[PDB]
Amino acid sequence: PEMVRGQVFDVGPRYTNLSYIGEGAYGMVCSAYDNVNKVRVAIKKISPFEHQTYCQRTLREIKILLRFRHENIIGINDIIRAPTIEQMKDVYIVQDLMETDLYKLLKTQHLSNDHICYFLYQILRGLKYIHSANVLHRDLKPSNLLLNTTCDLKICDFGLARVADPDHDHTGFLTEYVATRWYRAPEIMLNSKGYTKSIDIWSVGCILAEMLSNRPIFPGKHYLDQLNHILGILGSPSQEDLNCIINLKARNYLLSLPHKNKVPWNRLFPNADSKALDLLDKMLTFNPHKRIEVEQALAHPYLEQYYDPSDEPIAEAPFDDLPKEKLKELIFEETARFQP
């Protein structure tokens, strides 16, 4: 088997000429040459089978990405694994090689308004499909938005995704959460399990803000610091908005805080397109019920040059406690179609 940084990376014979890219989650990412399609591709080695949790996230990713087919969502081209459950210790997932991602882009490159607009359009176009399938991504952030050399944008990393479940969204105050802190909606820290579509729209709002200044808008250093970042910009929540939070610990926390007034978007972002700031405002709404939905966002004046609902497709086919062993069989079965 081919080696990379001394670790077996065994993707032959179709895939040759490997280069290291990084770690991923439970393994290593490399580029390689696809001898059938004559293009370089990205391959991730995943070794999840020892842990319930890794198996859950790996199955989720595979099931979702194989069901989805959309220009703004990364596809699985191929999956390499052993012919038998017994011999299968790793799985390799093959995707189109994407030169960069929005995280790497934002740390080095000023974005034109035109790029910001095109990027936001493509993000919402893919999210419309995701949401149409009753799925929540739940970990949207710059590093999960991949881009190629012509700025085609594709959403990746569905490991934390869930089926939407708004009737079971409510929880207590300071309930632990898995998704990346700077892109977490305020309600996660107050009374929400992250089981409604509005969680994703908050994250997209945060990404829009970041695209306008090259810095995260709410860089919290820990669980509750994240809420305090948000309220420093949006200002204190309205009585009406507090009235939607029945949980007393959560409501009383917000009541304990000194009054804070709104920071106007046009002061945070003096060179931003005004339509962009109008849409930002509607995405970064404190109250999840009042927050703009994906289709409304696509229809906003900011995106009018791209908006075409007939060319923004929806999914044909909308969508734990299992042990390691059964999850491994599920992953084996789910990957069978790529075997010769």
| The three-state (H, E, C) secondary structure of 33-63, written as one string | EECCCCEEEEEEEECCCCCHHHHHHHHHHHH
Rounded to an integer, what distance in angstroms lies between the CA atom of residue 63 and that of residue 57?
Answer: 10
Q: Solved by what technique?
A: X-ray
Instruction: Write down how long the chain is.
Output: 340
Rounded to an integer, what distance in angstroms lies between the CA atom of residue 67 and that of residue 69?
Answer: 7
Specify the pairing of strand 78-80 against strand 91-96.
Answer: antiparallel
Peptide bond into 340 cis (omega under 30): no
In sequence order, what are the beta bridge partners of 78? 94
Rounded to an integer, what distance in angstroms lies between the CA atom of residue 68 and that of residue 243?
Answer: 39
The dihedral sign for the CA sequence 20, 137, 177, 234: positive
Q: b/e per residue, 63-81, with b = 16+ CB within 10 A?
A: bbbeebebebbbbbbbbbb
The answer to whether residues 130 and 73 touch, using CB atoms and an 8 Å cutoff, is: yes
The answer to whether residues 88 and 261 touch, using CB atoms and an 8 Å cutoff, is: no
Cα 30 to chain centroid, rounded: 21
Residue ranges of alpha helices (H) inside the chain are 52-67, 102-108, 113-132, 186-190, 198-213, 225-234, 239-243, 248-256, 265-268, 274-283, 294-298, 324-334
Q: For residue 7, which amino acid is it?
A: Q
| Selection from 141, 149, 160 nearest residue 58 by Cα | 160
Which residues make Cβ contacts (< 8 Å) with residue 38, sequence separation at least 6?
Answer: none
SS3 (DSSP) at 235: coil
SS3 (DSSP) at 277: helix
The answer to whether residues 178 and 160 touch, using CB atoms and an 8 Å cutoff, is: yes
Q: b/e per residue, 246-284, with b = 16+ CB within 10 A?
A: eeeebbebbeeeeeeeeeebeeebeebbeebbebbebbb
Residue 62: both structure tokens together: 């595979």
Query: Left, alpha or beta for 196 (phi > 0: left; psi -120 to 50: alpha)?
Result: beta
Cα 68 to chain centroid, rounded: 15
Residue 194: both structure tokens together: 């992250």
Which residue's entry shows tokens 């409304």?
A: 296
The dihedral sign for the CA sequence 143, 144, 146, 152: negative
Which residue's entry shows tokens 């052993």?
A: 82
Q: Residue 193, Cβ neighbours under 10 Å: how many?
A: 17
| Selection from 185, 99, 102 nearest residue 142 by Cα | 102
The 145-147 sheet, strands edge to edge: 100-101, 145-147, 153-155
Q: Residue 85, Cβ neighbours under 10 Å: how many?
A: 14
Q: Residue 321, Cβ neighbours under 10 Å: how many?
A: 6
| Selection from 133, 131, 59, 125 nearest residue 320 by Cα | 59
Rounded to an integer, what distance in angstroms lies between the CA atom of residue 192 and that of residue 174?
Answer: 9
Rounded to an integer, what distance in angstroms lies between the CA atom of residue 233 and that of residue 241?
Answer: 16
In sequence order, what are the beta bridge partners of 45? 92
Q: For residue 197, which amino acid is it?
A: K
The answer to whether residues 245 and 207 touch, using CB atoms and an 8 Å cutoff, is: no
Binding residue ranges for ATP:
21-29, 44
SS3 (DSSP) at 22: strand
Binding residue ranges:
21-29, 44
State the distance between the two ends of the chain, measured CA to CA, in whole angstroms: 19
Residue 39: both structure tokens together: 């293009």
Rounded to an integer, what distance in angstroms lies between the CA atom of residue 210 and that of residue 311?
Answer: 27
CA angle (283 as vertex; 71, 297 as ends), nearest 5: 45
Residue 13: both structure tokens together: 């014979």
Point out the residues that are catalytic: 139
Cα 135 to chain centroid, rounded: 11
| Selection from 59, 54, 2 nearest residue 30 by Cα | 2
Distances (CA, A) of 28 to 15, 19, 47: 15, 11, 9
Which residues make Cβ contacts (< 8 Å) with residue 1, sequence separation at least 6?
Answer: 8, 9, 10, 12
